[PDB]
Amino acid sequence: MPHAFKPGDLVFAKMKGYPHWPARIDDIADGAVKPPPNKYPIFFFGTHETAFLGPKDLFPYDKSKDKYGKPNKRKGFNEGLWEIQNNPHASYS
């Protein structure tokens, strides 16, 4: 049975105006800015952008990859697909 999201979890994350996007739940570094209440820091593969999202916009990667894990024209998407499949827990700084 599902637990709550934790850092390291792999997801497709949904933002308005963008397709469901390969992403992970990030850690917050010591001394780094904390997310709002009820939000997680999402790192987006490919773009390497960070946004703060709640669970309504987070789809677990394994369940969802057959639906959302196809190439897309958008900038950074295909790079993002390689990262989440090939090295999802790497430093992308």
From Swiss-Prot:
<protein>
    <recommendedName>
        <fullName>Hepatoma-derived growth factor-related protein 2</fullName>
    </recommendedName>
</protein>
<comment type="subunit">
    <text>Interacts with HDGF. Interacts with trimethylated 'Lys-36' of histone H3 (H3K36me3). Interacts with trimethylated 'Lys-79' of histone H3 (H3K79me3), but has higher affinity for H3K36me3. Interacts with IWS1. Interacts with H2AX, POGZ, RBBP8 and CBX1. Interacts with histones H3K9me3, H3K27me3 and H3K36me2. Interacts with DPF3a (isoform 2 of DPF3/BAF45C). Interacts with SMARCA4/BRG1/BAF190A, SMARCC1/BAF155 and SMARCD1/BAF60A in a DPF3a-dependent manner.</text>
</comment>
<feature type="domain" description="PWWP">
    <location>
        <begin position="7"/>
        <end position="64"/>
    </location>
</feature>
<comment type="similarity">
    <text>Belongs to the HDGF family.</text>
</comment>
<comment type="function">
    <text>Acts as an epigenetic regulator of myogenesis in cooperation with DPF3a (isoform 2 of DPF3/BAF45C). Associates with the BAF complex via its interaction with DPF3a and HDGFL2-DPF3a activate myogenic genes by increasing chromatin accessibility through recruitment of SMARCA4/BRG1/BAF190A (ATPase subunit of the BAF complex) to myogenic gene promoters. Promotes the repair of DNA double-strand breaks (DSBs) through the homologous recombination pathway by facilitating the recruitment of the DNA endonuclease RBBP8 to the DSBs.</text>
</comment>
